Amino acid sequence: VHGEEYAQKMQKRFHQTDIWAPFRHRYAYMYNSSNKNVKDYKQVTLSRYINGFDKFNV
């Protein structure tokens, strides 16, 4: 809406495009930079006790 030049220069971050630096608000630290609980808090609390939350990997 503000122009093709505006759209192009707003989406450009680095002058050097060889390097990939994906944007992160923060970087994962625990569990060797990984997420142990890929769920919501209710899901975690109930899945530790209630069946049906775990859909398995097979």
Partner 1 sequence: VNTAYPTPLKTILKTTPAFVVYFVFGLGFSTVIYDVVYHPKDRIERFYFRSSKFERLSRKRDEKLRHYFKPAIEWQPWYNTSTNNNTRPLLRY
- Is 52 among the residues that bind ligand PC1 (CB under 6 A)? yes
Cβ proximity to ligand PC1: between 10 and 50 the closer is: 50
DSSP structure class, residue 26: S
CA distance to 9, 18, 19, 20, per residue, from 14 (Å): 11, 9, 9, 9
Residues that bind partner 1 (CB under 8 A): 24-28, 31-32, 34-36, 38-41, 43, 47-57
Contacts with ligand CDL in 1-58 (CB under 6 A)? 40-42
Instruction: Measure the CA–CA gap between 50 and 42, rounded to whole angstroms.
Output: 11
Give contact residues for ligand CDL (rule: CB under 6 A). Answer: 40-42
